[model samples]
Target: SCATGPRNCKDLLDRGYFLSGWHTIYLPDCRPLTVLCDMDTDGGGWTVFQRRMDGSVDFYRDWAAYKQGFGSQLGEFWLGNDNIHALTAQGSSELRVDLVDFEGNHQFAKYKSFKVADEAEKYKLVLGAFVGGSAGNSLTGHNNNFFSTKDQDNDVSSSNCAEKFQGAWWYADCHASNLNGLYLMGPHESFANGINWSAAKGYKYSYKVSEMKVRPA
Candidate 1:
């Protein structure tokens, strides 16, 4: 189908690469050759996906290589029941991503899960000494300070001469090595076999700027 409407879209599918151009997918009597794709995130829910049409979008535990993607951009599918359920129930929510091509898949990285900021609050930790403590004085910041109460009792001891000499850090630090270990290494290693079971796909997010321009091909 081709998209044939206002300002920018009219010429987009003018060459008519699709079955009916944009009109093929346009709902009857709505508008001919109008281009549009629906999403499930606004409570609409999931849709079945076609082969790689977007990009090599995949899941990864390590966002250093690739950011976790929202499974909301399935192209060329009708949305309904099972599709939505599969997203929340299928696996441990961990996905290592890669690109899907006409022939095969390519893996780059993976991640455990994507936690919405609000949802993360439910796992509050009062167990760590620094969870709600002051920042500068604490050995580590709040995010990597501790998980349970026991983590609080375990602290650096001056007598443990080996720790200072061994360069083994117990908590997170911005240093490249530390960051790579706790943040990037686990993710990168897990995503080492990154493979996409589908096609290349993409999602769009809009940001407004004072100056902008568009180019046509």
Candidate 2:
């Protein structure tokens, strides 16, 4: 069971779990969606899984592709992350994310089997580095340096990269990437994938984005 051993994306895939959306999986109510592998430094980072009425397992890893691929079904799907420091500080064992749909409906998505902050400190590093290591920025409303905006359809806009999973970046609008979790595409002005740190230019942080195109209808 995942409760004891370190699980990876492949393990999850073997168990019939597939990418249902950006950093997400389609599963039942209580199962968890494991993103990174346990072997990696940030392997423990994960969230709850989900489902759709369309009944498809294939999903776009890039933001632009997701938009072009699933525009009509877009609204919101419990996307993004919760505050790591906040959850860890509270000694919370479970991860809870509040979500809003296109019709103004509100719901909560919860996940279990997380390593927690005490046993999984790497989770903090992954979350922190995701936004260029400005952990305090999200709390103080400072310039997160991470850019990109989301539209009503939950599609990404105004980015630098246009590649699929290769050149795209998964990002958030709030201090953390979970609250307004969405992918941004276009050329990265500062960094390549938002994980590599760079300061040679007049840039403090970099926004990771991606591009997706729809088939001619």
Candidate 3:
């Protein structure tokens, strides 16, 4: 089973998120993240890092100063929860991870690889993705297949079958580490005010999917 709490290796290697000690500067569980700044790519910046549970280190820059200052945005967007990404004066000051839109960023795509260390105790993996806002911004279409990776005989040559994912398919599969599970999202949908998948026909705020290993590959 999973020994340590789920960690964000995606944050460390690709996004530049690292640990500082026993805690981290940015995380998915701490809720979403936000920073404020001058709109014209002006002042302020954010530096993210983290400290491993065993006194080790896994860290990176995650996001650099994009005009706005630290005060421009509001909170932290942990890769372990569901939320949407937003701007300074936009709807909610909270910008959750939306894989659909994140794929558009082309930055988070680097987070696609899997990090499994033999010394590592847990079977942890992070599915970094985005959530749509109250706006029509939905995380549907090909982006829906962010988790549908192809099965391979060996771990090294496996591929992410993002192309296989179609919106509102009769059936879909969600792989939790090596545990490939199938389920249905919806064709008959609803949209609520907050961040939960609903029975409505709109996009939910994007969120990340994380899991620890029960057995190492």
Candidate 4:
């Protein structure tokens, strides 16, 4: 369960390391986790949790699938709810969400603080006020919401938002934004189904890329 490695990218950096890519880092629990680290960012040592670029992997999956995780660390993938919980549980951390449109319009949204509850709590989202970047407060409404999937409905809305939106996420009376939505390449016919950051692009247009990463604040 435990290994003699860096507890995280930050810990690794503190020990003198700048290399990035897939790495096996230990968590607070002393358990090792394999993840892609961001060596070039706001001082580096970022642990990427979710990345959607080419849509090579499907984001519209089930509950258990989301819990266990999907896709590759080397490519588009969700670092898993349980795993995110483990990382966030370590200490105070900031959340950074980077987005790009089909036209290469890049934007970013950073949360002053971010943490996820345990699976028993459905990996509930715990987030502080918006800090920086350009994506706006797209995920603000989902601050205290519980994560949902096609097979699981933990949203406040009567209907399943995951099913309606064609993706799994923390939906609060639906959602103001869902980065995990279907990757439709460009603007799709459906508004909410495609990957979107509503505050900037509106629900009609699907974004080209979306990435969520975390680091010590």
Best by TM-score: 4
For 27-68, candidate 1 gives per-residue lDDT tens digits of: 223333223221212121112121123323322122112111
Per-residue lDDT of 14-69 in model 4, one digit per residue for the tens?
77678877778877777778988887777888888999999899898999989988
Q: Candidate 2: which stretches are off by over 4 Å? A: 2-30, 38-148, 152-200, 203-217
Q: How well is each residue in 1-217 modelled by candidate 2, as lDDT tens digits?
A: 3344323233344455444323332222223442221122122233322222221222324434432222222422322222222223322233332322323433332333122122122112222211222221231221223322232212133433323112222332212222222222222343233322222111222223211111000
User: Candidate 2: minimum summed lDDT over ten consecutive residues — where?
Assistant: 208-217
Q: For each candidate, C-alpha RMSD in Å?
A: 19.2, 15.5, 17.5, 1.5
Identify the leading candidate in terms of lDDT: 4
Q: Once superposed on the true structure, which residue ranges of model 1 sit more than 4 Å away at CA?
A: 1-52, 55-92, 101-105, 119-217
Global CA lDDT of candidate 2, please? 0.26
User: Which candidate would rank higher by lDDT, 1 or 4?
Assistant: 4
Question: Could you tell me the lDDT of residue 54 within candidate 4?
Answer: 91
Q: Give the CA lDDT, 0 to 100, for residue 133 in model 3.
A: 38
Ranked by lDDT, top first: 4, 2, 1, 3
**lDDT of every predicted structure (CA atoms):** 0.21, 0.26, 0.20, 0.87
Better of 2 and 4 by TM-score: 4
Candidate 1's error at 28, in angstroms?
Answer: 35
TM-score of each: 0.17, 0.23, 0.18, 0.95
**204: Cα error in model 2, Å:** 11
